[PDB]
Design an enzyme around this catalytic site. Sequence first.
Site, mmCIF file in Angstrom:
data_model
loop_
_atom_site.group_PDB
_atom_site.id
_atom_site.type_symbol
_atom_site.label_atom_id
_atom_site.label_comp_id
_atom_site.label_asym_id
_atom_site.label_seq_id
_atom_site.Cartn_x
_atom_site.Cartn_y
_atom_site.Cartn_z
ATOM 1 N N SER A 106 40.800 43.971 41.987
ATOM 2 C CA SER A 106 41.301 43.447 40.702
ATOM 3 C C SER A 106 42.593 44.150 40.330
ATOM 4 O O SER A 106 43.552 44.056 41.099
ATOM 5 C CB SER A 106 40.192 43.433 39.638
ATOM 6 O OG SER A 106 40.507 42.618 38.502
ATOM 7 N N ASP A 246 36.205 32.820 42.334
ATOM 8 C CA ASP A 246 36.955 33.946 41.767
ATOM 9 C C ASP A 246 37.851 33.525 40.588
ATOM 10 O O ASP A 246 38.566 32.512 40.673
ATOM 11 C CB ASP A 246 37.874 34.513 42.861
ATOM 12 C CG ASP A 246 38.179 35.996 42.716
ATOM 13 O OD1 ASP A 246 38.325 36.546 41.586
ATOM 14 O OD2 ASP A 246 38.282 36.627 43.791
ATOM 15 N N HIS A 273 34.625 37.118 41.562
ATOM 16 C CA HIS A 273 35.578 38.233 41.420
ATOM 17 C C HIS A 273 34.991 39.499 42.055
ATOM 18 O O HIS A 273 35.692 40.257 42.713
ATOM 19 C CB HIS A 273 35.897 38.453 39.942
ATOM 20 C CG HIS A 273 37.145 39.233 39.676
ATOM 21 N ND1 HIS A 273 38.393 38.824 40.105
ATOM 22 C CD2 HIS A 273 37.347 40.364 38.947
ATOM 23 C CE1 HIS A 273 39.302 39.689 39.680
ATOM 24 N NE2 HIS A 273 38.694 40.639 38.994
#
Length: 299
Positions: A106, A246, A273
């Site tokens: 991320s 995602d 994610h």
Amino acid sequence: SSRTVPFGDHETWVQVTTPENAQPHALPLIVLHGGPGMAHNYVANIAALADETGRTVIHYDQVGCGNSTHLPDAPADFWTPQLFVDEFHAVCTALGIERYHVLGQSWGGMLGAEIAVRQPSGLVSLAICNSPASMRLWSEAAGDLRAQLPAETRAALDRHEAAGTITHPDYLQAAAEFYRRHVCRVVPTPQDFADSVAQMEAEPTVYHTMNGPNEFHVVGTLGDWSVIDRLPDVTAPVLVIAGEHDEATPKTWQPFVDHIPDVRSHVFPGTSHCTHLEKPEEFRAVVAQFLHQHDLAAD
Ligand SMILES: [Mg+2]
């Protein structure tokens, strides 16, 4: 084992996981957590790679969160990608790591890219996991995914945002559904993830400042962020990982595969994610192939 290392006047907490059967030329992997300010906890399981591939794995808490120095009194403009780049190299230096692989998740992949675009001599490979290449694309993606929700769920999100009633139960339910589809599909939320969130909420300086408190869009100091025009400068090989569902949708990470000179991607079906939590073994298997390929190249 773990300790703090100096970063300027501050202390960065690091954890070193050593392999049970160290393999020749298996270079160390440095794992960068997201948030920003989420701490290492939610990506703790990537340390399994140490035993699985015969290399050392390093986690750390980026300054301002978790087990590292908290600086609630720093000016907001203290918290920059450059700060975390500088910290990264400070960690490598204190641990005596010359050549390394980086994996970032991320924000950690955003930070990975910031590290890479600067052409550090020791960087052997970078795995960008579930990351956008700009906040503009990240926001576009949020709208696209909301368009894909069931009409009832989208209506609750739209309606309550328009009215400002964003603590209404309908909104809370619809936002949690978005979360379960696109952030983490494992129910209940893995405890490692819960632990990251708890430490952040206890002392949210970094996360509130850089990301912000807004559910769907980055309103913090990262709001304008982009690495796209520096991606041609990456000289390291790059693996781009994403989930099928995602929040980092294909348009968000397309600039990485379009502009990084040496790049490949892997999209995991049935994940979102937090791929590393949703299909941990599959995730690590793909990462392990990449790390091994570039161990060989570095050697
Ligand atoms: Mg302040």
